């Protein structure tokens, strides 16, 4: 089963191995028990040349697991900026809502990491998308008095 | 001649002891080092001093008196101070280690580390006695140590000693000087538990004292040295009859005869008149009248109430100084002609009266002037009920909400001691307004 | 009540461990070589609450320091002060945590956790009269805040009866940016709720603001954060090291600031507030009182203060201090609970610290502290929903559960501050 091993390959970030899985009839939309992908894992863990080796391979760039994760919501909830930016060229959802109603705006907002912020505005994110409790990621960042972040969603 | 044993427990009761002792020399003629040139026997003595002082076969009069605190910052103070050769060495005991504002501490596990070895010292003392009346204890309520090693120590003197007195001077809770937000607590653990030990209590407000130092003596922001001296004037004023020759309060059961008509409320006011400032050396003498009406005036008295809302079951004067009698007399009778002075219908509604015919002395370094008459009023009335409900009410704001609770819990105290103490208060207040 | 002994675990904890040291040694009049050269008697009638004296009547501080990172012993060797330490306390492992509180708590912590303690009863056996331990840590890492709540149970253990004190800097994205530092800090304040006395919560997200903002310094750097937590760690401090009127211990403060056992969290605050190499009572009580001035980012106006102690160093009419923090208490009286008569307590230190004529620090217990919980705890929910990164804990014998009961102790204790914010007199 070489899906098993890509999975394994993606998250480890060995490239060479990712090729060579692919080469050989590879699953790269293969699913691990919680519906997580080769490009799911390669978003989480960071590794950049994975994810854009992925996605000229026929990735589904907007793949959801068991909870509604996306790439992209992992990609901004751990902070990979250059990831990012890499699912935002090749189609991401900017706006795709998991299981808690929440989108990467919210998760980047929530875990301060700004420039994805900037970075997710500019590419269209909805500022009036409320989450499973009514919280908008404004809402988030005065509800914890995060001046600096209250200061980029008003710009 | 029958002894005294004073003891002074933790901070509060030892500063205070100390000034006290210091006035006492001074008043007798002791000096520093225990002599006195006007005892002309010598190794002993049936003297009205004898009551507080012991003497020794080389000429030394030594305070029969005990200090003990969990700490030793404050005894090390008496110590190496001026009446440092004054006192038994062996009279000054001092732990390791204070009960943290904790009346559960000073009374369940620090206290019991040193009880036994303060109770074979005031047997030491006691032995020395031909005829032993009773103990003299001084006291904080708010503090960990005058609470609950307070307490401790009652219990175990009424054990060991069943048949003699016991006074205390207590020091009541100001917020202007306070120490500790649990004050209010501990002020009712130690006045639950010492109740029924206790034949007569003094209580002193910090609150009053400190107004007083303020108003009177011009001090703008009085520290404990200057409150200790004055309640030292007003201690002195009490003890006297106890000390000298006199014919009223002559022993510590006519304390008890005289003030407390039931066990329960014994508690007096304490009013003090004239305190004037040193400044003012040159001062008009104030007449008998004029410092006898002053003993009516709320902003006088040793604790901060309203006699005007209560009714007197028994008032004591007693005079220091240049004080004809037939003067009392004149006074008294026009304090008679006057409707905010009312007596229960029980009680006879008479003065009593005491002169000593020598003015008080004053201490260097003082805050008082020199006055050749002065007046200390002793009175049970019910208006001392007013102190018991505001501490009443801080303890009940804290405890509904079971604020502090959990650091005498985790010092070996059931939480329904608590509760207890509260009732035995709720029929304290009540036995005020049975009285009226 | 007099020795305190004194811990240092993680980078965070030995790096405001060093600066505190270098602080007080100035105050105190102690050298770099431990001799003291001082002036006034005041600096030591109370030296020996943190220094042991010596042969040659040299002074050492009774600190321990520990590390699983070998480094450490190294910058805190070249500092100043670095040759003050006694060379038998250096405890260090061989390989970091790499922030992972597991590896603290329960795997590589775990073996060097003995070796710790050996030191510890070696100071404290050296004790006349031992009042307790306080620690300097960071939540975030994995050293710190994994070994350090480790060896507070083990010396809760062992000394049952003693009051265990720290000094826990709480992380923010602002200054380090690591997606597990919610994890740890979490995990932490479930053992910090049980097992300490009082903790002073400095927090990386205020003392980040207070740089930006305040001091305009456009990239704050470590130093300029440690800078107000040494001014801060010398404040709080001043009543266990000068004698004053009050015979302060940190029994004392525990039994007077904390109503409830669990709400043990402090709000430090300070006046004037500096940058590196750069007043009046009434401005000092005003400043005291600002959110703008608070080491912990909640606004105390949003919250009500359980009990307050302040301690004011310099020459100053003690009858205006009197004046002006009774004012502050009558014009801000909303935000005092009204069922606990008498909740602020000062004091007045003629010694003040080194550059300051006058300067003003607040210990504050407020219910204000739960909008630091919830920022964490918000963090914490979010990389927990989706599981990120939870093998890098069970991988060390880490059991899923303790997440959940981390999680659920944390909003109890948010929920715990709620009841007393709301809670009236009647
Ligand atoms: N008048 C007067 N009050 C004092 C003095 N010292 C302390 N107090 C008051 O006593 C209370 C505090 O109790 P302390 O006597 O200091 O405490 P302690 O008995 O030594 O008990 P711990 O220190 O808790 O073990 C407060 O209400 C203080 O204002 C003093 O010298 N004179
Ligand atoms: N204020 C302040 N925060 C610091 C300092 N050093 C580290 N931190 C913070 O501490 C957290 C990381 O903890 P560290 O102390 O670096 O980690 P550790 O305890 O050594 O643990 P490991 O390196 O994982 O073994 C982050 O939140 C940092 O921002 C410092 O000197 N001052
Ligand atoms: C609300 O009532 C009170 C609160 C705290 C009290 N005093 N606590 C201290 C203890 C200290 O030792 C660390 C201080 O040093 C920092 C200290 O500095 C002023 C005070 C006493 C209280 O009545
Ligand atoms: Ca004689
Ligand atoms: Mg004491
Ligand atoms: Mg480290």
């Given at each position: 089963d070489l899906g098993k091993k890509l999975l394994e390959a993606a998250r480890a970030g060995q490239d060479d191995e990712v090729r060579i899985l692919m080469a050989n009839?590879?699953?790269?939309?293969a699913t691990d028990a919680s519906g997580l992908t080769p490009l799911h894992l390669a978003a989480t863990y960071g590794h950049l040349e994975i994810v854009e080796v992925l996605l000229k391979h026929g990735?589904?760039?907007?793949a959801i697991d068991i909870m509604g994760s996306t790439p992209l919501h992992l990609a901004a909830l751990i902070g990979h900026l250059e990831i990012v930016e890499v699912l935002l060229k090749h189609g991401?959802?900017?706006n795709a809502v998991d299981t808690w109603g929440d989108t990467p705006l919210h998760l980047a907002a929530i875990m301060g990491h700004l420039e994805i912020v900037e970075v997710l505005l500019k590419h269209g994110?909805?500022?009036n998308a409320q989450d499973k409790?009514?919280?908008?990621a404004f809402d988030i960042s005065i509800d914890n008095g995060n001046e600096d972040l209250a200061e980029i969603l008003q710009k | 001649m029958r002894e005294c044993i004073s003891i002074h427990v933790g901070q509060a009761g030892v500063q205070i002891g100390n000034a006290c002792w210091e006035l006492y020399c001074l008043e007798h003629g002791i000096?520093?080092?225990?002599?006195?040139?006007?005892?002309?026997?010598?190794?002993g003595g049936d003297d009205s001093f004898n009551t507080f002082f012991s003497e020794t076969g080389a000429g030394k009069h030594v305070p029969r008196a005990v200090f003990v605190d969990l700490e030793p910052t404050v005894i090390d103070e008496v110590r190496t101070?001026?009446?440092?050769?004054?006192?038994?060495?062996?009279?000054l005991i001092t732990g390791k280690?204070?009960?943290?504002?904790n009346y559960a501490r000073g009374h369940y596990t620090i206290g019991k580390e040193i009880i036994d070895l303060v109770l074979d010292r005031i047997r030491k003392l006691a032995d020395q006695c031909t005829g032993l009346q009773g103990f003299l204890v001084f006291h904080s309520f708010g503090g960990g140590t005058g609470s609950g090693f307070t307490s401790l120590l009652m219990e175990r003197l009424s054990v060991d000693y069943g048949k003699k007195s016991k006074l205390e001077f207590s020091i009541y809770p100001a917020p202007?000087?306070?120490?500790?937000?649990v004050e209010p607590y501990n002020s009712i653990l130690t006045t639950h538990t010492t109740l029924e030990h206790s034949d007569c209590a003094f209580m002193v407000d910090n609150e009053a004292i400190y107004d007083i130092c303020r108003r009177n003596?011009?001090?703008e922001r009085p520290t404990y040295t200057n409150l200790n001296r004055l309640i030292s004037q007003i201690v002195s004023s009490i003890t006297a009859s106890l000390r000298f020759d006199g014919?009223?309060?002559?022993?510590?059961?006519e304390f008890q005869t005289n003030l407390?008509?039931?066990?329960?409320?014994?508690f007096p006011l304490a009013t003090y008149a004239p305190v004037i400032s040193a400044?003012?050396?040159?001062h008009e003498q104030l007449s008998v009248a004029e410092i006898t009406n002053a003993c009516?005036?709320?902003?006088?008295?040793?604790?901060?109430?309203?006699?005007?809302?209560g009714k007197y079951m028994a008032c004591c004067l007693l005079y220091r100084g240049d004080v004809v009698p037939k003067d009392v007399n004149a006074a008294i009778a026009t304090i008679?002609?006057?409707?905010?002075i009312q007596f229960v219908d029980?009680?006879?509604t008479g003065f009593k009266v005491g002169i000593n015919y020598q003015p008080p002395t004053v201490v260097p370094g003082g805050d008082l002037a020199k006055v050749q008459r002065a007046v200390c009023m002793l009175s049970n009335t019910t208006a001392i009920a007013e102190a018991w409900a505001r501490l009443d009410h801080k303890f009940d704001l804290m405890y509904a909400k079971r604020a502090f609770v959990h650091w005498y819990v985790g010092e070996?105290?059931?939480?329904?001691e608590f509760s207890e103490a509260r009732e035995d208060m709720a029929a304290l207040e009540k036995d005020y307004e049975e009285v009226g | 009540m007099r020795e305190i002994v004194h811990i240092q675990a993680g980078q965070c904890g030995n790096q405001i461990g060093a600066k505190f040291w270098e602080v007080i040694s100035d105050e105190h009049g102690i050298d770099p070589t431990g001799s003291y050269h001082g002036?006034?008697?005041?600096?030591?009638?109370?030296?020996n609450v943190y220094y042991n004296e010596a042969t040659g009547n040299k002074y050492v501080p009774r600190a321990i320091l520990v590390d699983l990172e070998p480094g450490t012993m190294d910058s805190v060797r070249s500092g100043?002060?670095?040759?003050?330490?006694?060379?038998?306390?250096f405890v260090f492992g061989?390989?970091?945590?790499?922030?992972?509180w597991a590896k603290g708590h329960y795997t590589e912590g775990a073996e060097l956790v003995d070796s710790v303690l050996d030191v510890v009863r070696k100071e404290s056996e050296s004790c006349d009269c031992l009042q307790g331990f306080q620690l300097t840590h960071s939540?975030?890492?994995?050293?710190?805040?994994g070994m350090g709540t480790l060896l507070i149970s083990k010396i809760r253990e062992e000394y049952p009866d003693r009051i265990m004190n720290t000094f826990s800097v709480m992380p923010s994205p602002k200054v380090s940016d690591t997606v597990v530092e919610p994890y740890n800090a979490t995990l932490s304040v479930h053992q910090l709720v049980e097992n300490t006395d009082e903790t002073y919560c400095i927090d990386n997200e205020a003392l980040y603001d207070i740089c930006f903002?305040?001091?305009?310094?456009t990239t704050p750097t470590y130093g300029d954060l440690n800078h107000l937590v040494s001014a801060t760690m010398s404040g709080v401090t001043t009543c266990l090291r000068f004698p004053g009127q009050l015979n302060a211990d940190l029994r004392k403060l525990a039994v007077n600031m904390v109503?409830?056992?669990?709400?043990h969290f402090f709000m430090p605050g300070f006046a004037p507030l500096t940058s590196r190499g750069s007043l009046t009572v009434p401005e000092l009580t005003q400043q005291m009182f600002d959110?703008?001035?608070?080491?912990?980012?909640?606004?105390?106006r949003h919250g009500r203060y359980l009990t307050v102690a302040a301690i004011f160093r310099g020459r100053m009419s003690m009858k205006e201090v009197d004046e002006q923090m009774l004012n502050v208490q009558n014009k801000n009286?909303?935000?005092?609970?009204?069922?606990?008569?008498?909740?602020v307590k000062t004091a007045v230190c003629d010694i003040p610290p080194r550059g300051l004529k006058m300067s003003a620090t607040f210990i504050g217990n407020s219910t204000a502290i739960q909008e630091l919980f919830k920022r964490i705890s918000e963090q914490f929910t979010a990389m927990f929903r989706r599981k990120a990164f939870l093998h890098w804990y069970t991988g060390?014998?880490?059991?899923?559960?303790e997440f959940t009961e981390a999680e659920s102790n944390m909003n109890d204790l948010v929920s715990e501050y709620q009841q007393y914010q709301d809670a009236t007199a009647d």
């Open positions: 009839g590879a699953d790269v939309n990735a589904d760039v907007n991401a959802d900017v994110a909805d500022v409790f009514g919280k908008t | 000096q520093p080092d225990g002599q006195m040139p006007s005892d002309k026997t010598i190794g101070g001026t009446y440092r050769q004054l006192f038994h060495p062996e009279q280690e204070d009960a943290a504002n202007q000087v306070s120490t500790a937000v003596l011009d001090i014919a009223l309060n002559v022993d510590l059961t407390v008509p039931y066990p329960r409320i014994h400044e003012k050396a040159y009516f005036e709320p902003a006088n008295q040793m604790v901060k109430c309203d006699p005007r809302h008679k002609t006057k409707r905010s029980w009680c006879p070996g105290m059931e939480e329904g | 002036d006034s008697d005041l600096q030591l009638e109370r030296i100043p002060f670095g040759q003050i330490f006694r060379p038998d306390n061989q390989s970091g945590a790499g922030n992972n939540l975030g890492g994995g050293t710190g805040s903002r305040t001091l305009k310094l109503p409830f056992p669990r709400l959110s703008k001035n608070m080491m912990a980012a909640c606004d105390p009286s909303s935000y005092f609970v009204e069922w606990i008569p008498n909740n060390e014998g880490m059991d899923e559960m």
